[PDB]
Design a protein around this ligand. Structure first.
Ligand SMILES: *[C@@H]1O[C@H](CO)[C@@H](O[C@@H]2O[C@H](CO)[C@@H](O[C@@H]3O[C@H](CO)[C@@H](O)[C@H](O)[C@@H]3O)[C@H](O)[C@H]2NC(C)=O)[C@H](O)[C@H]1NC(C)=O
Ligand SMILES: *[C@@H]1O[C@H](CO)[C@@H](O[C@@H]2O[C@H](CO)[C@@H](O[C@@H]3O[C@H](CO)[C@@H](O)[C@H](O)[C@@H]3O)[C@H](O)[C@H]2NC(C)=O)[C@H](O)[C@H]1NC(C)=O
Ligand SMILES: *[C@@H]1O[C@H](CO)[C@@H](O[C@@H]2O[C@H](CO)[C@@H](O[C@@H]3O[C@H](CO)[C@@H](O)[C@H](O)[C@@H]3O)[C@H](O)[C@H]2NC(C)=O)[C@H](O)[C@H]1NC(C)=O
Ligand SMILES: *[C@@H]1O[C@H](CO)[C@@H](O[C@@H]2O[C@H](CO)[C@@H](O)[C@H](O)[C@H]2NC(C)=O)[C@H](O)[C@H]1NC(C)=O
Ligand SMILES: *[C@@H]1O[C@H](CO)[C@@H](O[C@@H]2O[C@H](CO)[C@@H](O)[C@H](O)[C@H]2NC(C)=O)[C@H](O)[C@H]1NC(C)=O
Lengths: 193, 597
């Protein structure tokens, strides 16, 4: 009765994919039938529980991951199908108990001048184990010669920036993603529908 | 730590950096071409210079990766495109001088005006004035004035500019490790690395000449037929055994004999198929016309047009307030942005060309998941060939009947069929000797085999022998008629048109065989054939990742270009011409001329 719990879902702005955000949710009345008649979610599929039983269930702990990615890369937010986002930015555990949510923002995140406020990692040393972050700006140097100083011939700055214009194709328009995960513990907290 | 992994990361950085820069340049150039202002042209040039500078930086970088040590054919290709020194191998001042004369030639061609000596107040530029004369005038003297005025005015200016253009371009390509500018151009067809599908740069000459030899007889009979029919139109001006006067061919140069249909119609009693009257009468929405092309492409298993296309494309003439470039173009701006720029009128010619440009867009939509440097046709001929198979299918009377612009009279005499095939030949085979000779002359000039003092001598000697066309007035080396064509004076290769004409009928035969068509090939409409659609999409998706020979084999089963599709398409007209010319002269006289002494 204290948490709409969507200060996350609809708000002014979100965070980059490589620096995705976590939030705790507690003491809530989770009604998700009105959100079924909300702006259509590009994709809403659950893995551990039933979408037709959501509110009946009274789970203990709930967490919310919110971040922004491209349109073609969105279908990588799933167990397996490792790719650019699914390794270097945000991987999910193979055993997953939760739900994933995404919708399309036509001109909210996109402006006529263009939006260059969202970043993403392209070069990293190793694939990220589930639920890991690495925000370090370490100049990647795969070739043995470690420049380490600045931009180099075989060196690269590992962080790239999205370009989001209002005339883009659907494959790379700004998709906004929220992930719900219920950790499995023998300890209770206050959540139910 | 391998070079291949290093090269992969370099290519990743280039693709992601270049996608956005190319998109900005494309948006700016679109805003110019759809809205001619000084602000827009300056923004376009700014974005274009930024793109060229980024490309040259990446070129000098990619040259630091030793190509020979690359074992990945796909990556080797992307690196090769980037390592091309291109114009940069020229000195700075010499390159500036080359760009200056290039822009000057383009300007004088697109701006040259000729004035009537009897009335110096009437003056026409090439489009639409001079083209209107060359298309519709039936007066020999007026046409001869138009022909000679265009050449003797603008081409004389182009002559010295063209000499400097030739010499600098041959040197550059040589510095870029080629023999001449034609060899650079021939490099587009070169394949080096795939065992069993490679194809050399002289084989193109071998293949083009071997195939033009097989085209030769069909063209000879059409030439004889058109020559007799023109004798009825210009009495006492044409010899029954001589070449055709260059100024009576339907346009300024003879690239197309389209406007000779009225003078060569086999059976004028049959109604010549024009759907323009039906279009104006039927409820017409220019939107619906382009939508009908879209409905056609989905019916064969291809996707709709994008919402971005329908919102950003320019589908109508913007009017007097907003001046735009009306040359039909299909824009692939990148980042999934696809548009069509066309000042569409409600006409039959524009209907087929709308299909053609949307065919381009489907090609452009395809292979989108390929890396940047692979977003291109298999070779320079694949895109236009695809557009043309689209336009043929739309032009068949069965399709025209099924769409409802033709009443279901379903009249198809053996004379209605020959009429349609004859009009096709005026266009399709009339352009082949022109294309082959222009590129042959250009290749030889680039090779330095035609002395400077015999440019026009050899030009018109070659003119006579191959195309069977003779100049109406003599031209010394003061004149410069080759530079009087747009593609020549604007630094565009021309052999794409020969190659695309052959490719398109190979594709048409293959896709109609896939659609299990049985009648004559020219009556084939591949509409409603998801099998043919898939076979074409299976080829469209490669882009420039696979060699064009391998891509061509995947669909038609042959590693090389073939003439039997064209000859089988035109076989009925061929026999009809052979019958019609029994008491007519077949062949050409390398010696008859209109003028004497
Ligand atoms: C996030 O999104 C929007 C804010 O832009 C809110 O969506 C909606 O809020 C309105 C009220 O402000 C709801 O209208 C209501 O409809 C119900 C019946 O459905 C009616 O009983 C109420 O009296 C009111 O008229 C609308 O339904 C609602 N939609 C959804 C899907 O919630 C939402 O409040 C914002 N919340 C968060 C946490 O981001
Ligand atoms: C030359 O290098 C390219 C890389 O740029 C090689 O292409 C790549 O082939 C691999 C193996 O099939 C692809 O990896 C796969 O990706 C899918 C993505 O869903 C993943 O599920 C698989 O587990 C696997 O990791 C890779 O995506 C692909 N890359 C591209 C850009 O096409 C190519 O094979 C090399 N040439 C030769 C002859 O080996
Ligand atoms: C195009 O179609 C027309 C008919 O629609 C075809 O024409 C016909 O040709 C035959 C010969 O093959 C003619 O037969 C002959 O009749 C004469 C007397 O007129 C007789 O002396 C001969 O012994 C022979 O029996 C027929 O009359 C003629 N019909 C018409 C209406 O002209 C024509 O052959 C077709 N062309 C092609 C290339 O298929
Ligand atoms: C052609 O370019 C001009 C700018 O050079 C565009 O500008 C118009 O002018 C102001 C500029 O802010 C706009 O507020 C107007 O609404 C525009 N006038 C119109 C649309 O008539 C102009 O939009 C461009 N034209 C097109 C078709 O893009
Ligand atoms: C090829 O596709 C066209 C698509 O328009 C088919 O046209 C439809 O045909 C059916 C059956 O004759 C009619 O009921 C519809 O009204 C038509 N829709 C139109 C005209 O838009 C056509 O029949 C197909 N031909 C085939 C299957 O060979």
């Amino acid at each position: 009765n204290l948490c709409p719990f969507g200060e996350v879902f609809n708000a002014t702005t979100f965070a980059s994919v490589y620096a995705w955000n976590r939030k705790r949710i507690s003491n809530c009345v989770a009604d998700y039938s009105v959100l079924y008649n909300s702006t259509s979610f590009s994709t809403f599929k659950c893995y551990g529980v039933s979408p037709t039983k959501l509110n009946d269930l009274c789970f203990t702990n709930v967490y919310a991951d919110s971040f922004v990615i491209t349109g073609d890369e969105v279908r990588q937010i799933a167990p397996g199908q490792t790719g650019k986002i699914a390794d270097y930015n945000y991987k999910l555990p193979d055993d997953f108990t939760g739900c994933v949510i995404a919708w399309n923002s036509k001109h909210i995140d996109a402006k006529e001048g263009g939006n260059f406020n969202y970043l993403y990692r392209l070069f990293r040393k190793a694939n990220l184990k589930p639920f890991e972050r690495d925000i370090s700006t370490e100049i990647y140097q795969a070739g043995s010669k470690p420049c380490n100083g600045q931009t180099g011939l075989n060196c690269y700055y590992p962080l790239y920036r999205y370009g989001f214009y209002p005339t883009d194709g659907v494959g790379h328009q700004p998709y906004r993603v929220v992930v719900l995960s219920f950790e499995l513990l023998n300890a209770p907290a206050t959540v139910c529908g | 730590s391998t070079i291949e992994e290093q090269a992969k990361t370099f290519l990743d950085k280039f693709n992601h950096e270049a996608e956005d820069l190319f998109y900005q340049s494309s948006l700016a150039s679109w805003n110019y071409n759809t809205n001619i202002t000084e602000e827009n042209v300056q923004n376009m040039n700014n974005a274009g210079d930024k793109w060229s500078a980024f490309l040259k930086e990446q070129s000098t970088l990619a040259q630091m990766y030793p190509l020979q040590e690359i074992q990945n054919l796909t990556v080797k290709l992307q690196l090769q495109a980037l390592q091309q020194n291109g114009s940069s191998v020229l000195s700075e001042d010499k390159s500036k001088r080359l760009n200056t004369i290039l822009n000057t030639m383009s300007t004088i061609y697109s701006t040259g005006k000729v004035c009537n000596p009897d009335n110096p107040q009437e003056c026409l530029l090439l489009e639409p004035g001079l083209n209107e004369i060359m298309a519709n005038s039936l007066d020999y003297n007026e046409r001869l004035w138009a022909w000679e005025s265009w050449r003797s005015e603008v081409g004389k200016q182009l002559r010295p500019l063209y000499e400097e253009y030739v010499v600098l371009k041959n040197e550059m390509a040589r510095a870029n490790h080629y023999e001449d500018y034609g060899d650079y151009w021939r490099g587009d067809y070169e394949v080096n690395g795939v065992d069993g599908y490679d194809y050399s740069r002289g084989q193109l000459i071998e293949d083009v000449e071997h195939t033009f030899e097989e085209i030769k007889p069909l063209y000879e009979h059409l030439h004889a037929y058109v020559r007799a029919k023109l004798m009825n139109a210009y009495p006492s001006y044409i010899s029954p055994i001589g070449c055709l006067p260059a100024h009576l061919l339907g346009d300024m140069w003879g690239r197309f004999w389209t406007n000779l249909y009225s003078l060569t119609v086999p059976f004028g009693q049959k109604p010549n198929i024009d759907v323009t009257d039906a279009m104006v009468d039927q409820a017409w929405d220019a939107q619906r016309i382009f939508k009908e092309a879209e409905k056609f492409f989905v019916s064969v298993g291809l996707p709709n047009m994008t919402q971005g296309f329908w919102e950003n494309s320019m589908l109508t003439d913007p009017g007097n307030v907003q001046k735009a470039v009306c040359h039909p173009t299909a824009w692939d701006l990148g980042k999934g942005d696809f548009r069509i720029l066309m000042c569409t009128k409600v006409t039959m010619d524009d209907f087929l060309t709308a299909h053609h440009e949307m065919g381009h867009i489907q090609y452009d939509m395809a292979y989108a998941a390929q890396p940047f440097l692979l977003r291109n046709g298999a070779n320079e001929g694949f895109h236009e060939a695809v557009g043309e198979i689209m336009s043929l299918s739309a032009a068949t009377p069965k399709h025209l009947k099924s769409i409802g612009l033709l009443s279901p009279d379903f009249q198809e005499d053996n004379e209605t069929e020959i009429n349609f095939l004859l009009k096709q030949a005026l266009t399709i085979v009339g352009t082949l000797p022109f294309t082959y000779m222009l590129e042959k002359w250009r290749w030889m000039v680039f090779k330095g085999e035609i002395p400077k003092d015999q440019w026009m001598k050899k030009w018109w000697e070659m003119k006579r022998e191959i195309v069977g066309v003779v100049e109406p007035v003599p031209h010394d080396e003061t004149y410069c008629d080759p530079a009087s064509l747009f593609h020549v004076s604007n630094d565009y290769s021309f052999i794409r048109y020969y190659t695309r004409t052959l490719y398109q009928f190979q594709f048409q035969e293959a896709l109609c065989q896939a659609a299990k068509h049985e009648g004559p090939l020219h009556k084939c409409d591949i509409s409603n054939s998801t099998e043919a659609g898939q076979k074409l999409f299976n080829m469209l998706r490669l882009g420039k990742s696979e060699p064009w020979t391998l891509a061509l084999e995947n669909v038609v089963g042959a590693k090389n270009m073939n003439v039997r599709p064209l000859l089988n398409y035109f076989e009925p007209l061929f026999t009809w011409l052979k019958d019609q010319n029994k008491n007519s002269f077949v062949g050409w006289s390398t010696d008859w001329s209109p003028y004497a002494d």
